Amino acid sequence: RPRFSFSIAAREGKARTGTIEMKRGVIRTPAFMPVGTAATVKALKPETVRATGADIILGNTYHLMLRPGAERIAKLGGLHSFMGWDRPILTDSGGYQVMSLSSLTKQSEEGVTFKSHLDGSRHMLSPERSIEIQHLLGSDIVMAFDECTPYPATPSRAASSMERSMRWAKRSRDAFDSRKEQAENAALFGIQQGSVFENLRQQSADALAEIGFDGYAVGGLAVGEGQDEMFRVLDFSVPMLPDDKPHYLMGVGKPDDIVGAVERGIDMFDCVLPTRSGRNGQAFTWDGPINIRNARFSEDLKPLDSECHCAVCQKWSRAYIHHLIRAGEILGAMLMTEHNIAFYQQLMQKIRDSISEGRFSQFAQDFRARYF
Amino acid sequence: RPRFSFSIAAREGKARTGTIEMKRGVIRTPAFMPVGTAATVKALKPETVRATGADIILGNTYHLMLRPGAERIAKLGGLHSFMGWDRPILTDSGGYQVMSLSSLTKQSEEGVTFKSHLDGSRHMLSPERSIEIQHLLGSDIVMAFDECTPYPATPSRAASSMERSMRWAKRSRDAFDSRKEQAENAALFGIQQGSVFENLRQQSADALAEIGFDGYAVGGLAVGEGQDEMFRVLDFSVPMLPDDKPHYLMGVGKPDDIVGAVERGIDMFDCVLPTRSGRNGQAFTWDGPINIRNARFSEDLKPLDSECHCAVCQKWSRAYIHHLIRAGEILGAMLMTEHNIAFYQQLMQKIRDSISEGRFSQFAQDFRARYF
Numbered sequence: 001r002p003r004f005s006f007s008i009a010a011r012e013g014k015a016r017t018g019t020i021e022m023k024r025g026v027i028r029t030p031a032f033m034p035v036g037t038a039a040t041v042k043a044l045k046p047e048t049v050r051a052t053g054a055d056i057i058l059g060n061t062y063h064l065m066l067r068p069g070a071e072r073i074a075k076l077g078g079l080h081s082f083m084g085w086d087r088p089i090l091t092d093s094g095g096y097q098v099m100s101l102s103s104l105t106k107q108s109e110e111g112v113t114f115k116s117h118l119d120g121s122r123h124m125l126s127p128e129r130s131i132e133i134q135h136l137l138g139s140d141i142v143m144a145f146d147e148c149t150p151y152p153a154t155p156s157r158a159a160s161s162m163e164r165s166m167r168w169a170k171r172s173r174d175a176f177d178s179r180k181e182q183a184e185n186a187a188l189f190g191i192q193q194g195s196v197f198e199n200l201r202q203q204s205a206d207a208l209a210e211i212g213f214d215g216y217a218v219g220g221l222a223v224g225e226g227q228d229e230m231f232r233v234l235d236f237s238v239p240m241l242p243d244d245k246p247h248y249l250m251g252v253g254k255p256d257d258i259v260g261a262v263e264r265g266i267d268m269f270d271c272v273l274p275t276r277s278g279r280n281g282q283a284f285t286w287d288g289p290i291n292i293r294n295a296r297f298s299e300d301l302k303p304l305d306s307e308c309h310c311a312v313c314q315k316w317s318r319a320y321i322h323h324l325i326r327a328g329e330i331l332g333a334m335l336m337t338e339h340n341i342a343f344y345q346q347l348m349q350k351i352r353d354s355i356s357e358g359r360f361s362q363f364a365q366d367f368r369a370r371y372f
Numbered sequence: 373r374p375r376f377s378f379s380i381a382a383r384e385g386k387a388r389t390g391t392i393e394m395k396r397g398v399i400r401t402p403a404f405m406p407v408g409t410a411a412t413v414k415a416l417k418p419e420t421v422r423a424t425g426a427d428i429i430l431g432n433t434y435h436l437m438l439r440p441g442a443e444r445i446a447k448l449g450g451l452h453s454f455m456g457w458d459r460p461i462l463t464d465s466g467g468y469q470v471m472s473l474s475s476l477t478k479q480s481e482e483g484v485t486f487k488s489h490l491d492g493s494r495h496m497l498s499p500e501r502s503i504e505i506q507h508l509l510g511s512d513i514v515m516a517f518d519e520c521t522p523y524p525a526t527p528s529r530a531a532s533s534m535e536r537s538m539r540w541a542k543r544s545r546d547a548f549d550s551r552k553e554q555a556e557n558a559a560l561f562g563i564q565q566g567s568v569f570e571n572l573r574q575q576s577a578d579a580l581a582e583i584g585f586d587g588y589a590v591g592g593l594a595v596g597e598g599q600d601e602m603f604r605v606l607d608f609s610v611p612m613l614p615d616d617k618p619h620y621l622m623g624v625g626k627p628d629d630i631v632g633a634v635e636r637g638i639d640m641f642d643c644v645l646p647t648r649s650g651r652n653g654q655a656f657t658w659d660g661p662i663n664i665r666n667a668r669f670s671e672d673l674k675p676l677d678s679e680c681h682c683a684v685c686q687k688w689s690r691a692y693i694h695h696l697i698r699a700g701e702i703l704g705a706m707l708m709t710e711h712n713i714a715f716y717q718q719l720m721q722k723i724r725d726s727i728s729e730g731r732f733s734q735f736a737q738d739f740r741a742r743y744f
């Protein structure tokens with residue numbers, strides 16, 4: 001296969017369905033990427049992740065650079081070899097989780113200095129260091145290092161962050177290109193910023209296209225603005241990005257958010273919702289989510305979802321999973337996560353098929369009627 | 373298959389190898405039974421438990437009678453259906469864990485009254501109630517309700533406990549026999565008591581054989597007496613039990629304890645050591661156990677054990693599992709437990725084959741030389 005090749009097979013409105021071909025595999029779009037936090041997709045062996053339908057997973061860079069170390073993972077053979085996932089891996093830049101999880105962060109034009117929320121150590125994450133870490137991890141899809149703008153953001157602050165992000169995108173591009181092995185085997189995605197402001201989003205899209213990337217992510221969303229606002233921004237933001245390249249909406253994963261985002265031109269998604277199960281007990285169904293811990297499920301012999309074809313819904317009842325979760329058992333987390341990620345992959349499949357068959361709009365309508 | 377049929381295929385000294393045929397399946401002996409605590413073998417799907425080589429698992433009654441309830445499990449279709457394990461299940465009586473884990477236990481000739489260490493509720497576990505609960509769970513091998521004697525024990529206290537246990541064994545037998553469905557589909561094992569005293573052990577064995585059971589467990593051991601003492605007691609205790617019925621050593625599982633116990637006539641074992649992994653990081657190897665959390669394993673690419681054929685040792689390195697455990701990841705627990713239970717099943721296989729081939733004594737010798 002080629003280093004990178006995105007081809008759109010079908011369209012309906014702003015929605016697209018196709019494939020991204022990479023050396024390690026084919027990614028069917030619209031795609032949902034399960035999240036591997038500390039070199040692991042929570043409570044699932046990689047074979048189980050693949051069994052659910054996933055073509056690619058997202059690897060958190062922040063956690064990896066701290067815990068085992070990027071250099072260590074490289075010495076061990078890379079992330080794929082390390083965790084046992086031989087298919088594509090998109091890695092974030094680590095900056096977003098640095099601002100959210102690290103201590104005493106100091107920002108500058110060079111990058112971000114911070115203290116680990118673990119051992120209290122120090123790091124200087126810059127566009128160059130971020131690209132290098134993703135290379136050491138052996139990432140297939142590398143994210144440019146940017147600065148996510150907090151919500152709400154004033155026009156001047158959103159402008160300053162976006163402009164810095166564009167300068168960092170140029171540095172990320174150059175860093176990526178100077179490393180021959182990485183430039184020839186991996187892909188680089190740029191990230192659009194600009195908060196909820198159209199003119200800033202336009203300036204960002206233009207700067208990104210001018211630099212040129214293999215894919216374009218819509219950043220700065222799913223940070224507290226709400227669905228109506230998120231959709232409004234995507235309405236004018238997605239059309240600004242190059243049409244022939246993948247559109248990635250970072251950190252967006254509620255089933256309805258995904259459907260609405262695909263209707264607006266998004267090709268890629270990632271979220272912790274599926275994997276962050278095992279505790280609160282939320283299980284997705286076509287009739288909306290349910291909390292398995294609720295007493296009404298104690299003697300419910302039916303599967304998590306009546307039509308889901310995952311191994312969990314074939315073998316275990318709501319009553320059993322209810323028991324496991326309330327007992328704090330590891331298997332409860334394993335079962336809930338497998339079903340949840342399976343449900344998401346089934347949702348992406350239904351989206352891909354409906355687009356290919358010119359009935360996506362009808363699918364979105366029917367999906368919402370039932371889900372809500 | 374029959375309700376119960378134990379046949380010895382080969383012998384070497386006191387050691388025996390054979391099979392126990394039951395309606396739900398065949399159990400190869402000597403056998404190791406993984407422990408399912410709250411209707412689950414810690415961090416493993418039942419198919420994974422079977423994949424390791426297990427023919428039967430042990431189900432804790434104490435936890436089940438409290439958490440989901442025996443009556444509830446019966447309404448849901450039984451434990452097998454509930455947890456997804458369709459093979460034999462040996463259930464303990466619940467008494468041992470009542471004394472170890474419950475609050476304000478009050479003992480009497482009728483049974484034991486206690487408070488749940490969960491909701492602070494109350495129960496009156498008696499021989500009759502214990503047998504009934506195991507029936508409601510749909511147990512294949514039912515353990516008679518007894519009174520484990522604390523170590524150390526004075527002759528008079530050991531005598532009083534053993535005598536009460538024998539009276540309770542008679543009540544367990546009668547209770548089992550009066551329930552037609554249970555008497556026709558399940559088996560009943562009696563438990564020998566008597567602490568470290570030979571005369572008491574002899575009195576216990578005689579009372580048990582007089583009542584008549586499908587199997588005989590050696591109780592009152594692995595309670596703080598040490599290996600030398602345990603072996604000394606087994607030396608004279610096992611020969612007292614009927615030779616043509618299985619000999620079950622309860623709560624014994626260290627690899628060397630198992631080998632020594634088989635040399636003394638034991639056919640069945642169970643222990644939490646394999647399943648209780650995922651935290652401290654102990655992994656069994658043919659070169660003795662290792663603690664994967666140790667820094668020396670951070671960059672060790674070799675599998676947990678060089679010859680173990682489990683899926684974990686085929687796919688992941690010590691370095692990866694080291695990382696997972698230290699990161700507190702669920703997958704670390706899943707991987708460690710699968711390997712550990714797989715290692716135990718491989719040990720039982722080596723024991724079964726060496727006995728069948730008349731070279732068990734040599735195997736025990738070679739096993740210890742390397743393990744220690």
Ligand SMILES: Nc1ccc2c(=O)[nH][nH]c(=O)c2c1
Nearest residue numbers: 096148219220221222250251
């Ligand atoms: N919701 C998210 C999630 C992740 C990211 C990111 O990694 N970079 N930049 C972003 O804007 C962003 C937004």
Ligand SMILES: Nc1ccc2c(=O)[nH][nH]c(=O)c2c1
Nearest residue numbers: 468520591592593594622623
């Ligand atoms: N080590 C163990 C473990 C369990 C038991 C038991 O369940 N009954 N009786 C016993 O003596 C006993 C000893």
Ligand SMILES: [Zn+2]
Nearest residue numbers: 308310313339
């Ligand atoms: Zn399912």
Ligand SMILES: [Zn+2]
Nearest residue numbers: 680682685711
């Ligand atoms: Zn192994």
